[PDB]
């Protein structure tokens with residue numbers, strides 16, 4: 001049950017004026033492709049606040065990567081889902097090395113040591129967002145991404161033909177994608193969706209990985225890409241949501257760099 005939106009004043013959408021004339025803003029299966037300019041965040045924020053949405057943000061910070069947590073969480077506090085309930089889950093082998101970062105109200109952090117758990121996510125959050133920790137939020141990352149299942153366009157392949165995508169190409173692998181298949185090349189550093197859809201993804205990925213290991217063949221990205229080929233995501237994030245400015249600059253087609261590699 002979705003309650004009524006309030007009165008809001010904003011510019012009328014123009015049916016005969018395309019949103020962007022430089023990029024694809026919807027997939028062939030009618031999933032939006034989220035670029036700056038495609039969304040009114042005020043409408044979306046209302047929609048998700050009225051549902052009292054809670055978002056889990058999972059990071060794995062092992063060994064030397066704990067060094068990146070401080071900048072990651074600090075910048076998340078400024079840019080990630082500001083205004084909504086956020087639950088950080090930091091998986092680490094060094095719980096004591098996790099920095100004390102000050103969190104805004106309605107936001108919490110759990111440290112989970114690694115050397116009825118998945119069940120925990122189902123009762124605690126509505127969506128899960130899984131990302132790499134050696135990263136920095138530089139601009140808005142908000143509820144526009146939220147959907148049952150989403151992937152993010154790999155920043156070095158978003159203009160490439162499918163032949164050039166570095167999918168798994170060996171037929172013996174469960175991640176195998178032939179040269180004549182593939183919609184996009186998704187990167188493993190930013191994906192998510194509902195808790196249910198994310199658990200299905202990681203479960204299917206874990207089983208495919210074990211089958212490959214059993215067949216003497218050896219990763220994350222290739223399996224994610226196979227999964228999202230066969231289970232089309234309900235939104236697709238533009239490379240705004242995972243960029244490397246040192247490696248790729250700031251091209252015109254990116255009006256914002258939201259989430260980036262660290263110099």
Ligand SMILES: [Hg+2]
Pocket residue numbers: 018019020037038039
């Ligand atoms: Hg638009």
Ligand SMILES: [Hg+2]
Pocket residue numbers: 058128129130198
């Ligand atoms: Hg995750």
Ligand SMILES: [Hg+2]
Pocket residue numbers: 058059060130131132188189
């Ligand atoms: Hg992840």
Ligand SMILES: [Hg+2]
Pocket residue numbers: 201202205220223224227
């Ligand atoms: Hg996966």
